[PDB]
Amino acid sequence: MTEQQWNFAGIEAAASAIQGNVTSIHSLLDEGKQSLTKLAAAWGGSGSEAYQGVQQKWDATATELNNALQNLARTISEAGQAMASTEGNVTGMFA
Template sequence: MTMRYSFAQIEALKLRIDSIQAQMNSKLDDLKAHVAPMVADWEGSASEAYQAQQAKWDSAALELNQILDAVGRVVGQGNADMQQVNTAAANSWA
C-alpha cells in the first residue's frame, strides 16, 4: 500500500478553507450593513418577523463558522501530524 501526501497542497487547502470563511463572513456583514437602514425604519410585525429570521440566519452562520473552524483545525493538525511521521520515518534511516 502506498501513501502519498502533498503537504503544500494540504496546507493550501487549509488556507482556502480560512479564506472562504472570511469571504463568507465579509459578505454577510456587507448584507447586514446594506439592509440596516431599512430595518431601522421597520416597526411592528414586519420588524419582528425580520428580527426572528435574522436570528435564524445568525445562528446558522455561527454554526457554519464553527464547522469551518473545526474542519480547518483538523486539516491543519492532520497535515502537521503527517509531517512529523514523515520526518520520523526519514530520521529512522539516518
C-alpha cells in the same frame, strides 16, 4: 491523475483554501449582516418580529457554519500545518 479523489497539490492547498474560505464567511457574514438590518425594511420594518426571526435565523446558521468552518479549518489547516509536519504533532495533541 489515476484518481482525482484528492490530489496532493490539492489536499495540500486544500487546507489553505479552507482558511481563506473560513475568513471569507467570517467577513461575508459581517457583510450580509449589514444588509440584514438594511434589508430589514424589506421584512416590513426593522422593529418587526418578521425581520427579527430573520436576524436570528441569519446569525443562527451563520455562527453554525462559521464555527463549523473554524473547527473544520482547525483540523484541516493542520493538513499543511501539523498533519504535514508529523504524526502526534497534530492539534489533537499540540495546543
